[PDB]
């Protein structure tokens, strides 16, 4: 039984909103660390988006996605192979934003025009400012050696889809475009070889 | 061989106690022992050695300044401050046993605790949306530790047992502990080192004895130990977490154990209990006793 | 029935004082002899001996306009003639009859000492002590006080607050109301069961607190044996129904006659002794056989009940447990129907293999005929004509239940507004230091057994009886008043208004010695009930954190004194702003938001920008100076910000 640590940085190409009040105030705050107040990307959002994109690509019922993201169906209890930690705002990006006195999270003012009265309703959303970076840690559990390559190809397809997709918030409207840069792939636990394995 | 194990948590942890919404700052020894058993099963390591030769302590808070033990259950001759005082620095705890701690210093110790902050993440399930349904919200409890703070526990065992614990904890670093692990929580880093201070608290002789872990004695030991004791009887219930156990997830048999920090004038040895019912493998619950001797 | 006559005489021993106010004892014997049932020798002898039976005399030792008295005497004559009778189980109606009328009457008039003890309290304490002395004598003055003739017994429930919020939250609003009611009524059932075994009236219950009972019992060894039997019975019953979810402990301390009189200060120290035993018993709380019972359960069970999370008990199709389902069902009946019926068959289980079910007044009498020894508790009924009933006070105010069509909607009708933001206001209020105050609310010299009971009784009435009158005319639904801690849900506009009205009525009730800290939240209707209670409780925790009187309105940052919120915000600032928008055609929500953006800006430059904005705004000169002055001050700015927000919320749509 081996474990493969994936170390990576997620780059905010367009303002990221993962959601998670007073009048006249942003009513859609992003998820933030309760202590450090640095906005984060919940690992649940990454895992769910990857699972959804894998479902769309393969098609959930499919045995491959179910093993990768966990199964609780009767007679088919499977442990999730992808344990993805919540993304943490990176130190380098934190320094680059400390310079030039730039806030970590931009606010975006949006309006909806009604189809009947043509009136406009205004919403202020919080988005992680474009150019930010979130360290991402993923643990892949090698339950079976024979399926490692196939699972990693599935991960690669999911990552590529997410590069062309968004992450959280309203992505059909521009929010959530992200790019994954993987710092390293390495076998933290066990003797398995992950040198040839590339997430992207 | 008492070994102090310190866990510093990178991401928030759930550590559920009764629901998914609520979060506990620590876990009892039974949860950590179950995690160790699961890890040994995954690593193809024998369970008998860990079950027999290992006695572990509940997880307890610590800061850069002090390591906090549970408040002993002893008679107090104000009371709201002592109720609020859940954890005491180990140097303060001997004074608390001596009874020198007043109400104001009790409140000061209680406020001194800077373990971390408990939050509640609001998430959704979108599975139904694809199958012509609506999304459903839910909530996951979280506890994020301050950068200096962390959790710790003391483990006593043979040298081979200690090495096996080291390997299992090295794996548990990435496996994680608590609820909603493998979904963004419970990730931690562990460091195991001998601790002279804890050994000094370990070696002690007193009229009274206090549990460091959630435990319960067998009936024969219960007859002698129960008398002249002040204890908190906590219920340990849960769903089995395994693929081998059954086709569908099955609840464990309800257990009741003396909470850590309970005071017994007569000590009892612990017992590993089986809360399995009609399952393929027996589900183990840790009820062994870790003892500290004190004078009141 | 000599003991029965003693209770009748002891409670009525001071009845001659009232007619005197209109040898008072001789008049009372003369007055009481008029009514035929009240002609037993013990009843008549008790009235005469009090001024100087012998037990009535010694019991009394331990303890406006005449026209108004005459009318009350005239009313008392009518009630005694037609409504009141002498007999076993008929004393309870009499004890209610005394409470309704004699509460205002002072025990002693035209006396130098404080008239802080009501006649009902004086009579009730005398009646309770008289029964205690009689039981001790059946067991078999200055020397009498020295010997220990009384036991101080208190019982406290455990995990009552944990049980209330045991909700899955699938049906939280109804569960929270009923679970609190069940704990309150189950407490009364336990008290009534203990008194019935001892053959004592409700007079022996000196006072009650939520989750707690304070009783005075005879020191006779027979009564001590009952406590061993009663505690062991209820200890096993709770284990049967609630496996460690609920518990009760009973501790008794022997007290002499001088202790009750507070001679040498032993009275206050007496309670501290029993409480320490009570807490020591909660430390053990279980026995060896009880412990082995818990871990001897054979099969865990496939499915579990959502609220209870218990799999051992039978679980129905809707996944509710046997206890849980009744609690949800009983919730609807309690608000609609006044009478509480302890029937052998019902919804929510009660000890001694009985059940609790809420029934109509015709349902209550029907239940009485079906089963003997059935207990009936009325809710908020001041009438004492009804027999075999004990009046229980509860706060059940719902504006939705006023209209059957609105009752269908529930809290959703509160957000239904013609104008203003549709939001649900949540109020969580708690009395400040009430546990500490109850010890220190009265001086040690003034402290007495009758003194403390009046304090608890007065607080209980305000939490439940008086609160419903306060909320009259407001879209507010009381989830529960419990004891000192309140939980209300209603329209954001009416919750804030009534919280101020609650505060001012509380001050007059407590004469300023007591304050309560509350947190107020604002949520949409679709917002979960459980999250409303959790987040608003933290807001209260903020107001409680500050010294004594504080309120947390909406966001945590907005914390103000009750006088500050009512006067400095709503009246000083918001009212001029309200008339400003109406009066000026140019002024619009847009003007308010622009001022609000300049406010909430730490830079002092925005203060100049506000003045620039105010200059061309064409606002009235007095208000323009007022708004500018408020902005410059650090504290007044917060108040001005809140003033605009309230106006913005109140004027939406």
XYZ file of C-alpha atoms in Angstrom, chain B residues 29-168:
140
model
C -7.998 7.446 22.377
C -10.459 5.018 20.779
C -10.635 7.089 17.578
C -6.848 7.302 17.259
C -6.531 3.585 18.016
C -9.099 2.763 15.333
C -7.138 4.935 12.901
C -3.960 3.060 13.841
C -5.714 -0.280 13.300
C -7.002 0.847 9.894
C -3.513 2.015 8.936
C -1.966 -1.290 10.023
C -4.573 -3.114 7.935
C -3.710 -0.972 4.909
C 0.044 -1.345 5.477
C -0.458 -5.131 5.895
C 0.837 -4.944 9.478
C -0.291 -7.330 12.212
C -2.968 -6.051 14.582
C -2.198 -8.326 17.539
C 0.955 -6.487 18.635
C -0.757 -3.086 18.513
C -3.868 -4.372 20.300
C -1.987 -6.097 23.112
C 1.180 -4.136 23.841
C 0.078 -0.524 23.217
C -1.617 1.835 25.682
C -2.258 5.335 24.322
C -3.508 8.613 25.786
C -6.313 10.838 24.523
C -5.303 13.731 22.295
C -4.854 16.939 24.278
C -4.173 20.565 23.322
C -0.774 22.215 23.458
C 0.649 25.622 22.607
C 4.205 26.838 22.218
C 4.022 27.779 25.902
C 2.244 24.908 27.686
C 0.940 21.324 27.188
C -2.597 20.961 28.579
C -3.886 17.885 30.466
C -7.622 17.238 31.298
C -9.065 18.755 34.444
C -9.190 16.069 37.156
C -12.590 15.269 38.635
C -11.940 16.130 42.290
C -14.061 17.761 44.969
C -13.992 21.567 45.117
C -14.825 23.259 48.416
C -16.441 30.436 41.194
C -17.755 27.028 40.167
C -18.557 28.457 36.731
C -14.847 29.159 36.237
C -13.987 25.557 37.127
C -16.658 24.343 34.705
C -15.121 26.539 31.998
C -11.654 25.221 32.938
C -11.384 22.097 30.806
C -7.594 21.861 30.359
C -4.750 22.808 32.759
C -1.000 23.284 31.955
C 0.858 20.295 33.429
C 2.738 22.482 35.995
C -0.624 24.146 36.971
C -2.336 20.700 37.163
C -0.147 19.561 40.110
C -1.087 22.856 41.878
C -4.769 22.157 40.988
C -4.419 18.697 42.580
C -2.839 20.402 45.652
C -5.942 22.601 45.545
C -4.026 25.910 45.546
C -5.694 27.029 42.238
C -8.362 29.713 42.999
C -11.277 30.719 40.739
C -9.585 33.748 39.163
C -6.464 31.768 38.255
C -8.723 28.992 36.962
C -10.391 31.469 34.599
C -6.974 32.837 33.622
C -5.767 29.296 32.766
C -8.973 28.638 30.801
C -8.521 31.828 28.773
C -4.838 30.961 28.338
C -5.927 28.132 26.039
C -5.209 29.154 22.440
C -5.638 25.808 20.699
C -7.514 27.167 17.695
C -10.831 28.255 16.235
C -13.866 26.088 15.467
C -15.756 26.841 12.251
C -18.489 25.333 10.086
C -18.068 24.846 6.344
C -21.235 24.904 4.239
C -21.079 22.530 1.265
C -23.463 20.977 -1.268
C -24.212 17.732 -3.058
C -24.946 18.301 -6.751
C -25.419 14.628 -7.658
C -29.201 14.945 -7.969
C -28.898 17.939 -10.313
C -27.569 15.702 -13.083
C -30.372 13.170 -12.499
C -33.141 15.782 -12.775
C -32.998 16.737 -9.105
C -32.045 19.592 -6.828
C -28.757 20.171 -5.035
C -28.770 19.634 -1.285
C -26.731 21.667 1.220
C -24.966 20.262 4.265
C -22.453 21.389 6.886
C -19.090 20.025 8.042
C -17.564 21.022 11.357
C -13.968 22.210 11.341
C -11.280 23.164 13.828
C -8.229 25.085 12.622
C -5.295 25.180 15.021
C -3.232 28.282 15.629
C 0.251 27.983 14.089
C 2.030 27.350 17.392
C -0.731 25.148 18.812
C -1.399 21.488 18.078
C -2.563 18.243 19.601
C -0.499 15.632 21.415
C -0.692 12.244 23.081
C 1.531 9.976 25.160
C 2.027 6.354 24.115
C 3.639 3.618 26.212
C 4.794 0.342 24.702
C 7.681 -1.946 23.898
C 10.480 -0.797 21.602
C 9.102 -2.792 18.646
C 5.635 -1.460 19.523
C 7.013 2.091 19.539
C 8.656 1.574 16.146
C 5.438 0.161 14.709
C 3.615 3.191 16.118
C 6.185 5.449 14.447
C 5.593 3.806 11.063
C 1.811 3.900 11.485
